[model samples]
Target: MAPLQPGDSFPANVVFSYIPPTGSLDLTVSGRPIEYNASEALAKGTSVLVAVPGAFTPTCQEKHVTGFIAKLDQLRQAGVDRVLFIASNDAFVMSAWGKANGIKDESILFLSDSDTAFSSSIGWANAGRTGRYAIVVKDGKVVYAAVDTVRGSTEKSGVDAVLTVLGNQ
Candidate 1:
């Protein structure tokens, strides 16, 4: 499948491990793994989905995640429902990373593409890892999509680009 673009609906079957805001692995609506449906979960609202190759990567740690956290208020003012940070790491590592970054708020969700299911579904994988990308989704459909082809470049995708899209929305 090709990378998802504006006008394409998020795939409902794509699921990922979600580390809840509370940072508790013991909490789950069902006894099943703590996961979410990519399409259905964000289907009813506007969300920013940011993908990185892995948690704790240099560029991601220093700039990408920081920008999202710092600009959260601006994003909320723009009517964004949530900011979802997805990485190629597993749920445990993601939870740890979120905790280390002081991300305990519900407004931001840290998800794990452990099996690369979600990233693969969107054709956003590079060399067995997820690419750096961002997708602004409104009501289950992509409103904007940006992928950073360069490993460390923040040119096409990041908080600023997503905010620009949100401003126009």
Candidate 2:
């Protein structure tokens, strides 16, 4: 399938494990890990989904994530109820990275796309790695999708870029 475009409905059942705020370890639901599929997660909310190439890459840590962290309030004020960080790393690494970065904000979720299923399904993966990208979803449909010109490059898809898009909407 082609890459998802604006107005596309995010795929259902594309799951990711997210560690919520106040979590010391994994959370569970349905007798399984607290996995959330896109449909349910975004069913009625405005969400910002940011994809990073890896958990601890330099730009992702120092710039990309930092930008979002610093601008989260503005994003929230702009109508984003949920801010999700998706990386192609295992849940554990993603969890640790969040903790290491002092991510305790309830509005931000660290999600593991470890299997790359979600990124791949959206045609955002290349050579087993996820590219830097961002998407805005409202009521389960994509409203904006921005991809860096180069893999893992945040220049064109950072928080400011997303915020600019949100500002215009």
Candidate 3:
């Protein structure tokens, strides 16, 4: 399999794990983790799929994730319905990461691709970890996708590139 590119059909049943937010914003509270099929969700509306090497890694924590969180309003205004952030981190860690970022809800979902299945399938895994990348899906089709070559960089996978791509489209 190859990394997804523009014009490719979003694959089906690409399941990832996540904890459903249940109103309380306490980081100590653990929510029940469940499976989420990205293809099914993306088929319903426009969505962004962000894959990172790890949940709390330096680049992802300090730069990559913040960019998306900060511009979430801009993304919604641009017609995005949801954003999914995936890493090989377990569901628990993924959930905590969201709360740490002050996310009140699932505007941007932090998900666990626990086995790196999805990432490896798309040639987006690095040393058995999910590689840093971003993909935009609109009604079941890939509108854009790119990966960062350097582990510490997000040049091609950052939200800025996504916004630019959406703008161009």
Candidate 4:
């Protein structure tokens, strides 16, 4: 409720075990697209939501994703099953961005929220900042969530904070 912030009670109506439609989505990094929600894309029980912006701006490049890359091992050890980097772009661009950023090897999932379909539904499709946020949905309930600051895009919205709040799981 109230757009989901820390310390708020978990909301179940908004969270669903959603598997995005599978297909070739677009991205800015590369023109080539990649399939969405493909079986090969994710393994089950992955604890991830998404982080996105209106465009592939600098903050998203340097902070949103690279921040995760910088703390990959620590996040993994902290029990973050998977992290999916999303943008309102196409698959190809996402792929290219991942490659250009040298993040493909890091084993993070890059995806497109092209058309803001899911983003809009989740109440985060802001034309600005796209409101960097996280949804920790488990068993179809939003157990934990976090929203980032507008100009604070480059700031760290550490997932470790989430784990700590959830009491190490």
Worst 10 residues of 2 by lDDT: 24-33
Clash pairs of candidate 2?
none
Per-residue lDDT over 1-169 for candidate 1, one digit per residue giving the tens place of the 0 to 100 score:
6678799887677677865665443322212238767667779789888898888999999989988899899998888997888888878777777777877667777788877777877788866678899988899998998789887887777888988888887
Off by over 4 Å in 4: 1-34, 38-46, 154-160, 166-169
- Tens-place lDDT per residue, model 3, 104-164, is 7889899999789999888988676998999999999999999999868889999899999
List the candidates' TM-scores in order: 0.89, 0.88, 0.96, 0.67
Q: Which candidate, 2 or 4, has the higher lDDT?
A: 2
Worst 10 residues of 1 by lDDT: 24-33
The count of residue-pair clashes in candidate 4 stands at 12
Best by lDDT: 3
Which ranking of candidates, highest TM-score first? 3, 1, 2, 4
lDDT of 4 by residue, 1-169 (tens): 2475534433333221222322323323234343455222333443556566733577677666666678777766656666777766666556666666665343566666666655565576777334677765444345567667657553334455545544645
Candidate 3 off by > 4 Å: none
Off by over 4 Å in 2: 23-33
Let me know the TM-score candidate 3 reaches against the reference structure.
Answer: 0.96
Separately for all candidates shown, the number of backbone clashes (residues 3 or more apart, or on different chains) is 0, 0, 0, 12
- Local distance difference test scores for all models: 0.80, 0.78, 0.89, 0.55
**Predicted candidate 2 versus true structure: per-residue lDDT over 5-71, tens digit per residue:** 8899877887788655564433232122367675687877898888888888998998999888898
> CA shift at 127, candidate 4, in angstroms?
3.2
Top candidate when judged by TM-score against the true structure: 3
